[PDB]
Each structure stands twice: as structure tokens, then as C-alpha cells.
Amino acid sequence: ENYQYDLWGDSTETNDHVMHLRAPKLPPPTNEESYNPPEEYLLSPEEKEAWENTEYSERERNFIPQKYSALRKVPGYGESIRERFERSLDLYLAPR
Amino acid sequence: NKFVRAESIVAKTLATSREKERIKRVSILEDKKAKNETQHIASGKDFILKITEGLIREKTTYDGKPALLFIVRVRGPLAVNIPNKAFKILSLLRLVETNTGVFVKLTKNVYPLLKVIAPYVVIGKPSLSSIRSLIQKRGRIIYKGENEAEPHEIVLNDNNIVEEQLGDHGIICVEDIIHEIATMGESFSVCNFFLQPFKLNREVSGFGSLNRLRKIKQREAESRTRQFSNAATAPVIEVDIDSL
Amino acid sequence: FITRSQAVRKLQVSLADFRRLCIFKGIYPFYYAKDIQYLMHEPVLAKFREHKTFARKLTRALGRGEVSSAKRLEENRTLDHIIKERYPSFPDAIRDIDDALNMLFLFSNLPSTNQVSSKIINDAQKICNQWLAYVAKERLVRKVFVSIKGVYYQANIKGEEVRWLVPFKFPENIPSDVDFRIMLTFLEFYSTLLHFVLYKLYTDSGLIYPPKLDLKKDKIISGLSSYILESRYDSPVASLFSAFVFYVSREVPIDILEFLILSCGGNVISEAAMDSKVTHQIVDRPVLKNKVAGRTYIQPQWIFDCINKGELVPANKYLPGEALPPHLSPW
Amino acid sequence: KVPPTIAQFQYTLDRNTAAETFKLFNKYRPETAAEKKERLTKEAAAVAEGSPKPYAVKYGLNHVVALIENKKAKLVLIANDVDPIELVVFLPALCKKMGVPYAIVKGKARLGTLVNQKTSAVAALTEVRAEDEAALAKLVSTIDANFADKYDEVKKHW
């Protein structure tokens, strides 16, 4: 019988007493990186080659937009773990 | 490299001789049963034993109905060199790899073959949810890579791959394979070959400080759950294979 | 100003334990000298050193050849009070729960491996199922976004607008570059925080906690729909598809579609569930061989567009095999 | 050089024979404090609500010495690294005079591991079950040829 207690209870105050609580900097909303984005953002072969040429840490646009009219046609994503691990590292491994 | 001790080789020889003696009797009994030599045998029919959780056993007569089954390697007997008679069967079924699994369809002829190699592996009927989870979270698929070589058995990365490989029997997504495995579909054999191994995660995988105690506990619990009956008439032992 | 080396020397703590303490205290880097002095008093460090000593004791017991002693030492052995100070109020915890939810969702799909205990994966899956059940019961979801890396789900818990990513149900790759040790330490705290928040919400306004899985249904339809719980309109997402049975073909995953329809208030049945008022069906195959008029065949995109809009748009640009309209970001 | 009585050590049970002796001894581990406590608590609980002698190895130096000279002990183990060597100089000769077989094993620490104690410097067994009596007799017979016949000239090597 654990966790059966109000951890926070009545509380309406923030950490403003000490302003060292830096904002978590949560990721912003998406930027049309959908499986069915506008046809204008359909990466061309030249654009795809240019994106592939760039290496890690210089890929601000870290997604290859493409159109998939069928859900089954969506390819598997294996880079999700690496990207979120990098986010976790950057959460607290950067000077502030 | 390592020197071979006399005791180890002697133990291996004794265990191999015992297993060969058991296997010869099992094969003779199975051949006689196939010939309908019911004149003098220990048991006319056969049974399948089930162990469930405190721990109690269940026994039921074998029923002539096909059913989906999953088999995993148990890594033993500890000191028995697999005889060619069973080695060929294991190699054909590609379960020789430790901790590897594969789905098979129960049949009247398959059951006697399983009886011979029953101690070497663990068998049972997985649940639909467990089958779906395993298929969607594991399973190797051999294909020709990009153009040249075919070492990429990693995972079913894209559904379009399944359409390309076969294209004909309507197998366009992983759910089609799941349905064909759960149901007694014709494509069960086709997709079964497509996914030859099922490399399930192994045990603690190490010794450590506490990991050594965990391994010892697992080993001692195996003896209290699994047992090498060695009886030529030993009923097949079913367990909750989904517990993983 | 002191540095990581000075902090480690003063605290007399291992690098992994130092990182764990920094994460549990959010001591962002040089390091904050004024905060390390406060960190000098930490029961978590005492527990860590006690566990380290117990490890040596267990190794000694194993070496001496005494299983009973080892069992006694192992049996005879938290972040609850840590959360008290790093989350001053519930709104802050709700705001910061985005990373915790994302980590739990990512780990729930990770296959069991030697580098990650299967118990951790099971706990993450249970937490994700509990969160999905809570969201469906409260219908607080407002927008759905599909991406190549998953579906960018979001919730409006107390107006937070948190955005939690749901990874696609597929075998997850396991690159050796990622250090699971740090990920495991993060996941432990995130799971504890999620458990606390879920219990608090369930007791204050939700349902019984912890919910129990539907054993009978868990054998066949394990997932969000396999949960049973009981207690003791603000947006179209909570009113759409009222009493509408949205059938789903074998191609699409029921787990994803069923969540949305159940949150709205409808029902979903899949052809593979068996392995009726069927007003609608979702089909993604190139050819609709079934060709039935009773079940309204519509591409699944319309559900997302209707959820993001709420007008129940017809299937005009949603015919099976027809190119779907661009999924513009609602933000 | 050392006197003839010294250097009688350094000739000890071999790895195979020592391993066999430890395996046989490992089957008679005396009940530890925790095991005895839990057993007694269970017995008391059963009594409140409403077996022969426990065979175990003898390791106490005083107890072992008392067992010797009475022919009760069937086998004796001697630690070679005993810091007060005077405590162990007379044990081999005394056992030989009494005709009790013994085998020297390297390491007091290793010897103590079989009795859940840091060091005991001695170990012996008197009672043995039927399943292990034959094994104990065979080990005793083997130890004779292994040690006594291989070092009949131990008096040399000053």
C-alpha cells in the first residue's frame, strides 16, 4: 500500500522564490513533418541528396518530408531512440 | 586452447550413451505404434502434460486437431552431445540456436517427432495477444538487402517489403502474417519460412554480484519446473510459454 | 565556482551516482557551487552507498558458498520525497510530464534485451496503458498529428497543451551508441512521477487506481481496450462519432484507431479481433475486394481531420485509394 | 634450513583430491545462525499453535583434538598457513600415532569457507550418511596412497 497519499496536496505557488529553475525548453510543435504533408514540401532527389550530404549536428530540418497516401506505406523509424537519447543528454549536459 | 579433463569427457560420454539408449527405444516404440503394433506396448494412446500455477499438473488425452504451437530452445541437457538422429531434426527445424524459437503447426505426425525432442525444447500454445506482441516486436526476415547481399535479417522495417517479396497471397502487412499464423491459413508455411528464426531475448546474460544469485535461482527453479523424465513414454510437457 | 571534479571529490560519489543525483536535482553545469553545498545532505546518497556496501556483502556471501545467506541478504533490502521540492505545484509537474510521457511511450515499444530488464519494459507498458485509459475516460485529447517518427499526440490537461509522441508499433532498433544506464535512471524517475500524478488524478477526479487489466480480454485484445475500471463536451473530440461503430480493416492498427473513437464515444471492431451495427469501416488496401455498401468505406485520414476540426467532414476527399489532403499542422 | 618437523607441510592434497574432499565436505555444511534461528522460530510457532542427530563436520580446534585420540574422527584436515605454527606441529604426528587419516589443505581461509567461518585451521568429520559413507571411505583410502606413501621420507628435506 504505497503512493496512497497526496504528494502535492494544496499548492498554488511556483519556484519563483529561486529563479534558478531553468525552463525545460520542451520541443515546439511540428513543422509539417507529417506522413502526408503538402506536395510543395515533397523533397526532390536533389534536395534529398543535399540533406543526406549534411552530417549530424547540422540537420536542423531533421526529417525527410514525404507523401504516403497509404498508412501501410509508412516506413519504419529506427532513429527515434537516438534522437530522444540526444535530447535527454542535452537536457542537463549543457552549461546554463 | 583449454585443457580437457578426463572427468568432463567421461561425463559427456555417459550422458550421450544414456540419451542414445533412450532415443533408440523411443524411435522403436514410435515405429511400432505407426505400424499399429498394439499387441504389447506400455500405452496404446498418448497424453500431453501441462504444468500451471501452488504448482499443479494437468493431463489430457491427445486430440487429433491441428493447432498453432511455439517452441523455444532450453539449452540442454547440460553435458549431452546431440546425437545425429536428433541433431538432424534440430537443424531441419532450425531451433539449434540457443534461446531461438519458431512457430509450428501441430499434426498427427508432428507430435511423435516432438515427443523425441521434447526434453530439448519447451512447447506450448501462446495466446493471441502474446503472438501479436511477439510478431510486432520481434522476428527476423531474410531478404536481398539493397542489391547484392542478403545478411539483413534485422526486422520487418517496411510493409512494402512484404508486398514485394510475395505480392500474391495478399500478405501486405505484418497483421496479415499475424492472422495467417493464428488462423490455420495456407500461407502459414510460406510466412513460417520467411521468418525462420525467432530470436527471443535470453536470460540475465551475465554473472555480476546479484546477477549470479539471480542465475542460481533461475537454475534451481528450472529443476522444480522443468525435469528430464527420460521416459520413452513421457507425455509432452506444456507450460505457459507466454511468460516472457 | 567549482567543477565536476571538485564536486565528485567532495561528495565521494561515483560518476554514475553523481549523474543520477544531478538529474534528481537538476544541477545544470563548471557546476553550481552554491547548489553543491546544499547537495551535501542527501539521503539518496546514503542509500546508494548502503547499496554499494550490500553489493560487496553479497559478493562475499556468494564467494563463501552460502545460498541461504545470499538470499537473506538480498531479501533484506526512493524518489517519492525528491519530487516534493523539484515540482513545487501540480501545474509544473503537468507541464514537465511531456518528457516523462515520451520516454515511457518510447520504452514501452522496446523489445526485451540483456541491456534492459524485461520488468522495466513491462512497467513502462503498464504505465502507458494506464495513461491511455485515463485520456480515453477524460477525452482530454484535442488534436492528433501523424509524423514519420510517430503520431504527435497532445493533451489539454488543465490547459497545459502537452504534446506526447506515440511511437509506431514496429520492432525498435537498438543502437549501441545510446547509454541505457542514463536512460534507465531517467525512466525510473519518470515512471515514479507518472505513477504519483496518475494516482492523484484518479483519486481526485478520475477512477479507481491502480486499474486492473481485463484478464479475459488481455488474452485476445490486450491493450487500451483490455482495461476495466470504474469511478469508485468541451471540445468536438469528446463528442464526435457518438455511438458510431467505426470498423477497422486488418491493415490499420486497431490500438491506435480504437483509442480515438473510444475517447470520442464510438466503438471499434477489427476483423482480427475475433481471431452488428457496422455503420463505418476503414480500408487501406489498394483494391476494395470486399465492396460492401453497408459499411461506409473511408480512408482513415478523415478521422484525424474531423478530430482536428470537429465538423464531421464527409468522405469527399477520403475515398479508398484517393490521395489524402495535406495534414497541415494545427499549430 | 627448517627443522625436520617443519616442511612436513607444503606437501598437501592435490587439486583433484582437494576438490573431491571439498565437494564431500560441502554436503555437510553446519546450520548457520540464520538457518537455526528460522528453524527454531518455526518449531516454536508450531508448538504455540499446536529426527536423528544433525550430521555435520567438526572444525573447532579443541573439539577436533578431543575427537582425535578417541578414534571417533574418521578424517581430519589441517591448515598449512597457521600463523602460530606450534598449534599444528604436533597434529600430524599425533594423528599418525593414533592412526587417524588426515590430509593437509592449503589456505586457512579456504578451509573456513566450508563452515561459514573466516578461519578454523582444522576440519574433521565423524558422522556420515549411508549415501556418503562409501564416498568418505573411498576418499580416505585414496588419501592414504596420495599422501602417506608419497612422503614416507618426509623426515628428510630439512
Non-local CB neighbours of D105 within 8 Å, separated by 6+ positions? D12, D13, D18, D21, D77, D78, D79, D80, D111
According to DSSP, the residues that pair with B121 across neighbouring strands are B73
**Chain B contact partners (≥3 CB pairs within 8 A):** A, C
Give C68 to chain D, closest Cα distance, Å.
Answer: 8
Which of residues 36 through 95 in chain A touch C, CB cutoff 8 A? 36-39, 63-67, 69-72, 74-85, 87-89, 91-95
Name the residue facing A14 among C30, C89, C324 (closest C-beta).
C89
- Interchain touch C–D (≥3 Cβ pairs closer than 8 Å): yes
**Closest among C235, C234, C217 to C226, alpha carbons compared:** C217
Neighbours of C123 (CB within 10 A): 18
- The residue in chain A having the minimum alpha-carbon distance to the alpha carbon of residue C180 is A85
**Closest among C248, C170, C95 to A14, alpha carbons compared:** C95
User: A81 vs C106: CB contact, 8 Å cut-off?
Assistant: yes
- The CB-side HSE value for C139 (13 A sphere, CA atoms) comes to 17
**Closest among B242, B137, B211, B201 to C113, alpha carbons compared:** B201
Strand ranges for chain C from DSSP E: 146-147, 150-154, 163-166, 212-213, 227-228, 246-248, 280-282, 296-297
Please answer whether residues B203 and B217 qualify as being in contact, where contact means their C-beta atoms are separated by less than 8 angstroms.
Answer: no
- Interchain touch A–C (≥3 Cβ pairs closer than 8 Å): yes
Grid cell locating B65: 486437431
Q: Which residues on B lie below 8 Å from A72 (Cβ)?
A: 159-160, 172-173
User: B157 vs A76: CB contact, 8 Å cut-off?
Assistant: yes
Count of CB contacts below 8 A, A vs C? Answer: 161
| Residue in this structure with the C-alpha cell 534558478, named with its chain if needed | A20
- Interchain touch D–A (≥3 Cβ pairs closer than 8 Å): no
Q: Which residue of C28, C148, C165 to mutate against A (max A Cβ within 10 Å)?
A: C148
Please answer whether residues A46 and C131 qualify as being in contact, where contact means their C-beta atoms are separated by less than 8 angstroms.
Answer: no
- The residue in chain C having the minimum alpha-carbon distance to the alpha carbon of residue A10 is C89
DSSP output for chain D: ---SSTTSSS----HHHHHHHHHHHHTTPPP-HHHHHHHHHHHHHHHHH--------B--HHHHHHHTTTT--SEEEEES--SSTHHHHHHHHHHHHHT--EEEES-HHHHHGGGTSS--SEEEE----HHHHHHHHHHHHHHIIIIITTTTTTT---
User: B201 vs C71: CB contact, 8 Å cut-off?
Assistant: no
- The residue in chain A having the minimum alpha-carbon distance to the alpha carbon of residue B158 is A75
- The residue in chain B having the minimum alpha-carbon distance to the alpha carbon of residue A71 is B159
Domain that holds residue B24: 2-244
Name the residue facing A75 among B158, B172, B173 (closest C-beta).
B158
Long-range CB contact pairs, D31-36, < 8 A, 24+: D31/D56, D32/C66, D32/C68, D32/C69, D32/D116, D34/C68, D34/C69, D34/C72, D35/C68
Helix (H, G, I), strand (E, B) or coil at C212: strand
Q: Which residue of A13, A18, A34, A42 to mutate against C (max C Cβ within 10 Å)?
A: A34
**Closest among C146, C127, C238 to A67, alpha carbons compared:** C146
Please answer whether residues B191 and B171 qualify as being in contact, where contact means their C-beta atoms are separated by less than 8 angstroms.
Answer: yes
CATH of domain D1-158: 3.30.1330.30
Grid cell locating C71: 538470499
Please report, for chain A, the start and end positions of each structural domain, with discontinuous segments joined by +.
21-94
Q: Which residue of C251, C254, C284, C290 to mutate against B (max B Cβ within 10 Å)?
A: C251
User: C58 vs B209: CB contact, 8 Å cut-off?
Assistant: yes
| Residue in this structure with the C-alpha cell 556483502, named with its chain if needed | C57
Please answer whether residues D22 and D57 qualify as being in contact, where contact means their C-beta atoms are separated by less than 8 angstroms.
Answer: no
| C-alpha to C-alpha distance for D54 and D126, rounded to whole angstroms | 12
- The residue in chain B having the minimum alpha-carbon distance to the alpha carbon of residue A68 is B160
Q: Which residues on A lie below 8 Å from C251 (Cβ)?
A: 71-72
Long-range CB contact pairs, D138-145, < 8 A, 24+: D139/D17, D139/D20, D139/D21, D139/D24, D139/D75, D140/D74, D140/D75, D140/D101, D142/D17, D143/D13, D143/D17, D143/D75, D143/D101, D143/D102, D143/D103, D144/D101
Q: Which residues on C lie below 8 Å from A90 (Cβ)?
A: none
| C-alpha to C-alpha distance for B49 and B99, rounded to whole angstroms | 22
Helix (H, G, I), strand (E, B) or coil at C51: helix
Non-local CB neighbours of B124 within 8 Å, separated by 6+ positions? B69, B70, B238, B239, B240, B241, B242
The Cα angle at residue C15 between residues C13 and C16, in degrees rounded to 5: 105
Please report, for chain D, the start and end positions of each structural domain, with discontinuous segments joined by +.
1-158
Distances in whole angstroms, Cα of residue D142 to Cα of each of B234, C40, D56, D77? 41, 63, 22, 15
The greatest distance separating any two alpha carbons of chain C, rounded to the nearest whole angstrom, comes to 77
- The residue in chain D having the minimum alpha-carbon distance to the alpha carbon of residue C72 is D34
| C-alpha to C-alpha distance for B4 and C208, rounded to whole angstroms | 62
CB proximity B158 to A under 8 Å:
yes
User: A92 vs C252: CB contact, 8 Å cut-off?
Assistant: no
Name the residue facing C329 among A21, A31, A71 (closest C-beta).
A31
Give C136 to chain B, closest Cα distance, Å.
Answer: 21
> What torsion do the CA atoms of C188, C192, C195, C198 make, to the nearest 10 degrees?
-110
| C-alpha to C-alpha distance for B23 and C165, rounded to whole angstroms | 55
The alpha carbon dihedral of D65, D70, D72, D77 has a sign of positive
Q: Which residues on B lie below 8 Å from C222 (Cβ)?
A: 129, 132-133
Name the residue facing B127 among C171, C219, C251 (closest C-beta).
C219
Q: Which residues on C lie below 8 Å from B204 (Cβ)?
A: 114
Strands B56-61 and D122-125: unpaired
CB proximity D113 to C under 8 Å:
yes
Give C61 to chain D, closest Cα distance, Å.
Answer: 9
Name the residue facing C111 among B173, B201, B205 (closest C-beta).
B201
Non-local CB neighbours of C25 within 8 Å, separated by 6+ positions? C35, C39, C82, C86
Count of CB contacts below 8 A, C vs D? Answer: 17
- The residue in chain C having the minimum alpha-carbon distance to the alpha carbon of residue D23 is C65
Looking at the structure of chain B, the number of domains it has is 1
- The residue in chain C having the minimum alpha-carbon distance to the alpha carbon of residue D32 is C69
User: C113 vs B244: CB contact, 8 Å cut-off?
Assistant: no
| C-alpha to C-alpha distance for D137 and D139, rounded to whole angstroms | 5
Question: What experimental approach yielded this model?
Answer: cryo-EM
Axis-axis angle for helices B110-117, B84-93 (nearest 10): 120
Give C162 to chain A, closest Cα distance, Å.
Answer: 9
User: B213 vs C253: CB contact, 8 Å cut-off?
Assistant: no
**Closest among C91, C94, C89, C87 to A11, alpha carbons compared:** C89
Q: Which residues on D lie below 8 Å from C64 (Cβ)?
A: 113, 116
User: A63 vs C148: CB contact, 8 Å cut-off?
Assistant: yes
User: B212 vs C62: CB contact, 8 Å cut-off?
Assistant: yes
User: C58 vs B176: CB contact, 8 Å cut-off?
Assistant: no
Q: Which residues on D lie below 8 Å from C72 (Cβ)?
A: 34
DSSP output for A34-88: BSS--GGG---HHHHHHHHHS-TTS-SS-------SSGGGPPP--SHHHHHHHHH
- Interface residues of B toward C, Cβ cutoff 8 Å, are 127-129, 132-133, 136-139, 154-157, 172-173, 175-176, 178-179, 182-183, 201-202, 204-206, 209-210, 212-213, 216, 244
Q: Which residue of A1, A85, A87, A89 to mutate against C (max C Cβ within 10 Å)?
A: A85
- The residue in chain C having the minimum alpha-carbon distance to the alpha carbon of residue A34 is C147
Pick left, alpha or beta for residue B139 (phi over 0 → left; psi -120 to 50 → alpha; otherwise beta): left
